């Protein structure tokens, strides 16, 4: 079983303990570690942060302690403009440019593959996205003729029914990608004035219309569409989403007024790291959607939807039972990586739990 773990570049700048660098990563924790977001310049892959080539080095040294550990570089991301991605893949000329540029870049900095994080192809991009994948892989196959281990190619894919249908030819790209990461944690929030859980595993028979907004559907649909289980990787949250309540109500459907107040370390309205939540939990009221199988907490006028050890194990067994290829954890740097926020003296508690379940039968 695979355990893909993303690490984000900008997490280095959080203050105090919040600060996280590649060397804080347990080299045996995950099987695949993904350095988050490389940039594109003049149609060539390139660095982003001022010290990337240094962090690259840091991250890839872990490979000296664990020879089996594989690393990848993800392109795109949220601060990368989809349009941008669009422009590059639309023209065979700029596309080939970008592609030819990749292999050397990765060989140079020591990465074992490329992760495409084109954040949401449009109805008009579906045909190009497929192209970009074919040719990219075709190139990776050609570069392997030089006696080195073939480069890996993967992609983070939305788990949103409409999004999927609108921009992905899942049956095609699945044959060319080594694995696909399902962003199964973006089901709510997305600015809709009512409290709700972003990563529910299940259907929850109550108040519906969505029905498609849970990991289960997502997984099932993907399967239906043609993507093999042995290439699917389910996404697992290591952060929670917060909301500022507009009334004293707390149950399902509760009126919301906007995102939650920022955390002392991540400082971004609407998000919390698990380690911030661990601190938030002191003096709060914890609840759990039985049908969906995920927590949520409240304190004052703040409402939080998050994933805990159990929920995570839950989802992990789930993916095992459907026989998928593995789990994907968004934000090793959002987990309690110091192991000094969530109590039970343990480093990477959430990520660790997934591993434990995956190591089980
Ligand atoms: C990720 O790569 C991007 C593409 O190379 C790069 O984007 C930018 O490229 C230049 C370099 O700064 C920008 O320059 C400006 O825009 C106008 C002219 O177009 C000037 O008048 C102005 O003075 C300024 O120099 C481009 O605007 C911008 N281009 C695009 C298409 O985004 C990014 O800098 C890079 N991001 C990071 C974080 O490194």
Largest sheet: 8 strands, parallel, barrel
SS content category = alpha/beta
User: What is the helical fraction, as a range of percent?
Assistant: 25-40%
CATH fold assignment of the largest domain? TIM Barrel
Indicate the radius of gyration in whole angstroms. 20 Å
Protein name: Chitinase-3-like protein 1
Disulfide bonds: 5-30, 278-342
Glycosylation sites: 39, 345
Pfam families: Glyco_hydro_18 (PF00704)
Walk me through what this model shows.
- The protein has ten helices and 15 strands.
- It is an alpha/beta fold and 361 residues long.
- The protein has two domains: 1-238 and 307-361, Glycosidases (TIM Barrel, Alpha-Beta Barrel), CATH 3.20.20.80; 239-306, Chitinase A, domain 3 (Roll), CATH 3.10.50.
- The protein has an eight-stranded parallel barrel, surrounded by seven helices.
- The N and C termini lie close together (10 Å).
- The structure holds a molecule of 3 linked components (NAG-NDG-MAN).
- The site of a molecule of 3 linked components (NAG-NDG-MAN) has 4 residues, from strand 2.
- Residues 39-41, 48 line the site of a molecule of 3 linked components (NAG-NDG-MAN).
- Residues 302-316 are annotated as: Important for AKT1 activation and IL8 production.
- Monomer.
- One of its GO terms (biological process) is response to interleukin-1.
Present the secondary structure layout.
Layout: E1 2-8, E2 32-41, E3 44-46, H1 52-61, E4 70-76, H2 82-90, H3 92-109, E5 113-117, H4 126-143, E6 152-158, H5 161-167, H6 170-176, E7 179-183, H7 215-225, E8 232-236, E9 239-245, E10 256-259, E11 271-273, H8 274-280, E12 285-289, E13 294-299, E14 302-305, H9 309-321, E15 326-329, H10 349-359
Parallel strand pairs: 1-2, 1-15, 2-4, 4-5, 5-6, 6-7, 7-8, 8-15
Antiparallel strand pairs: 2-3, 9-10, 9-11, 9-14, 12-13, 13-14
Helix pairs in contact: 2-3, 3-4, 9-10
Bound molecules: a molecule of 3 linked components (NAG-NDG-MAN).
Disulfide bonds: 5-30, 278-342
InterPro entries: Chitinase_II/V-like_cat (IPR011583), Chitinase_insertion_sf (IPR029070), Glyco_hydro18_cat (IPR001223), Glycoside_hydrolase_SF (IPR017853), Glycosyl_Hydrlase_18 (IPR050314)
Domain GH18: 1-360
